[PDB]
């Protein structure tokens with residue numbers, strides 16, 4: 001059963017097997033007086049592991065590495081952060097210290113710096129324009145355009161038809177907007193439609209926060225976003 005927010009004390013990290021060689025990682029952290037769960041991805045990359053997003057903070061990200069070592073036992077050699085917020089780059093300094101090469105797009109690295117957040121070391125080329133996709137080991141990185149943030153990326157695992165939507169995709173049970181200070185509400189539905197067109201074969205869809213679903217989460221997120229804008 002996929003772990004829920006109340007089952008994960010702040011500071012602990014769970015791994016969840018999605019498919020052969022594909023895991024989500026789930027952690028918890030406080031934001032504006034409440035604790036929320038947060039997802040990222042782990043993908044086998046030959047004899048190495050590719051990490052998608054930190055576990056939202058240095059302490060959680062340290063627990064993430066320890067849980068990977070305990071449960072999987074292959075080295076995390078690269079990490080991609082899918083936008084500049086703390087649930088994605090919070091913990092980059094820990095990863096770097098542990099020997100992980102950290103990556104993000106130029107926009108993400110720039111926005112992280114502006115915001116005073118941790119900054120991934122290496123720039124990802126080829127993601128500057130809505131609709132751009134690049135291969136990165138066992139995954140494809142896709143920039144769908146502005147949504148939850150102007151820089152948000154999504155990640156697809158072809159070997160397993162896993163789409164990691166990050167914070168641009170909402171879980172089914174989430175019905176209000178939330179952390180949209182940095183969003184482009186008007187562009188968010190268009191960006192989601194690019195995701196639908198590019199990954200129509202996605203079997204598992206992982207939101208940035210909450211329970212995994214299918215492509216139904218895409219239409220679901222667009223409804224929520226609109227409702228926020230309507231009023």
Ligand SMILES: CC(C)Cc1sc(N)nc1C(=O)O
Nearest residue numbers: 031036087167178179208209
């Ligand atoms: C209601 C919460 C999940 C809002 C939060 S907290 C956090 N770190 N991210 C978000 C988001 O909207 O992506």
Ligand SMILES: [Zn+2]
Nearest residue numbers: 083085148167
């Ligand atoms: Zn965010």
Ligand SMILES: [Zn+2]
Nearest residue numbers: 085087167208
């Ligand atoms: Zn988030």
